[PDB]
Design an enzyme around this catalytic site. Sequence first.
Site, PDB file in Angstrom:
ATOM      1  N   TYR A 147      -7.055   2.541   9.612  1.00 47.17           N
ATOM      2  CA  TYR A 147      -7.304   2.814   8.474  1.00 47.17           C
ATOM      3  C   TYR A 147      -8.721   3.217   7.837  1.00 47.17           C
ATOM      4  O   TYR A 147      -9.455   3.113   8.772  1.00 47.17           O
ATOM      5  CB  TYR A 147      -7.104   1.217   7.770  1.00 47.17           C
ATOM      6  N   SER A 168      -0.271   3.968   2.676  1.00 44.08           N
ATOM      7  CA  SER A 168       0.114   4.139   4.242  1.00 44.08           C
ATOM      8  C   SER A 168       1.755   3.761   4.338  1.00 44.08           C
ATOM      9  O   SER A 168       2.531   3.603   3.423  1.00 44.08           O
ATOM     10  CB  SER A 168      -0.463   2.883   4.784  1.00 44.08           C
ATOM     11  N   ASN A 172       3.102   1.972   7.645  1.00 40.10           N
ATOM     12  CA  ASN A 172       3.377   1.195   8.526  1.00 40.10           C
ATOM     13  C   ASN A 172       3.090  -0.106   8.186  1.00 40.10           C
ATOM     14  O   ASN A 172       2.442  -0.575   7.193  1.00 40.10           O
ATOM     15  CB  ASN A 172       2.439   1.444   9.735  1.00 40.10           C
ATOM     16  N   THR A 200      -6.102   1.701  -2.645  1.00 42.97           N
ATOM     17  CA  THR A 200      -7.535   2.134  -3.124  1.00 42.97           C
ATOM     18  C   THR A 200      -7.899   1.614  -4.274  1.00 42.97           C
ATOM     19  O   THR A 200      -7.384   1.612  -5.401  1.00 42.97           O
ATOM     20  CB  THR A 200      -7.689   3.696  -3.202  1.00 42.97           C
ATOM     21  N   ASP A 255       0.636  -1.279   0.002  1.00 41.61           N
ATOM     22  CA  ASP A 255       0.178  -0.014  -0.091  1.00 41.61           C
ATOM     23  C   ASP A 255       0.749   1.230  -0.036  1.00 41.61           C
ATOM     24  O   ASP A 255       1.395   1.651   1.041  1.00 41.61           O
ATOM     25  CB  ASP A 255      -1.075  -0.267   1.221  1.00 41.61           C
ATOM     26  N   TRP A 299       2.586  -4.126   9.455  1.00 36.04           N
ATOM     27  CA  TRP A 299       1.878  -4.966  10.625  1.00 36.04           C
ATOM     28  C   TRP A 299       1.327  -6.259  10.002  1.00 36.04           C
ATOM     29  O   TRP A 299       0.811  -6.195   9.070  1.00 36.04           O
ATOM     30  CB  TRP A 299       1.063  -4.101  11.466  1.00 36.04           C
ATOM     31  N   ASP A 357      -2.331   5.664  -4.902  1.00 36.37           N
ATOM     32  CA  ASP A 357      -2.764   4.603  -4.002  1.00 36.37           C
ATOM     33  C   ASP A 357      -3.111   3.494  -4.585  1.00 36.37           C
ATOM     34  O   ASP A 357      -4.107   3.215  -5.296  1.00 36.37           O
ATOM     35  CB  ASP A 357      -3.907   5.088  -3.170  1.00 36.37           C
TER      36      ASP A 357
END
Length: 326
Positions: A75, A35, A37, A218, A32, A39, A215
């Site tokens: 998110y 963003s 991060n 999306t 992505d 995880w 993005d």
Amino acid sequence: VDEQPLENYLDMEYFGTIGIGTPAQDFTVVFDTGSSNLWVPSVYCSSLACTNHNRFNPEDSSTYQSTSETVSITYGTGSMTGILGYDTVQVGGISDTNQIFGLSETEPGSFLYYAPFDGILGLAYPSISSSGATPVFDNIWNQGLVSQDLFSVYLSADDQSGSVVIFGGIDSSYYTGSLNWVPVTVEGYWQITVDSITMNGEAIACAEGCQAIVDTGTSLLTGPTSPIANIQSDIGASENSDGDMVVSCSAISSLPDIVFTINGVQYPVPPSAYILQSEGSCISGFQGMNVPTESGELWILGDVFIRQYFTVFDRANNQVGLAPVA
């Protein structure tokens, strides 16, 4: 040229398989650009989403380094709170040593229960990383694992395999012609300026210029509610009983291209790309979502746009390169 193949999911989702720990525990994660991060679920989570997804087990990794700190990521839909740890990530053939990432403890809601991936692998700037967690690409570059501070994305059409993310490299077989470079305005997301969106030569929306983020996360071409409403009516899309912007499939052959002018150059998006076909029905790929940032309302060039153009994320110069796909 380190490549990470991605699995095209109904053209709506794109994710890849990465490994964490040593021995490497595998997880599917969305790559992505919206963003920063990284995880994945951990064994410490018991939320619905965690009962049917791969959960990282710190105990089985001889290279895990725990820390006191926690991460809380919110998110567009669904969240995740947890701690942050250090381990070795295997992404695209690279042994990303000492990569801090988030381990989920809670993932409220059922959205992520339905999502086909375990976690998310962010590729935007550090400035938008919750808790200042160093992004994977930043960590990879910082330790010299890639020759170039840039990566490129190719997203295949209608389920075809071949979607890739190439770290520190550009592959010219993935596009035709020359690459045009768009400078990044606000370094957080991959934000650029769109000069106008025309149709048949007329500025149908964003006529004064506006901000758009690239993005891969999306799936549609998103914009402020009002201008998108004009776009829908221009493409013959009306709301059905099921609150759906449907166009008649017999219209695809007759609809003009919607054109986005990005930094003096025209990037048309044909009706075959902005009118998705979901089970004998044609639904448009434009969705309204007002997203005010200090720089105003944001438009999102999601997968619909990205599928049409080979994109190069240049972190060295903070610009994105675009070129028609082959």
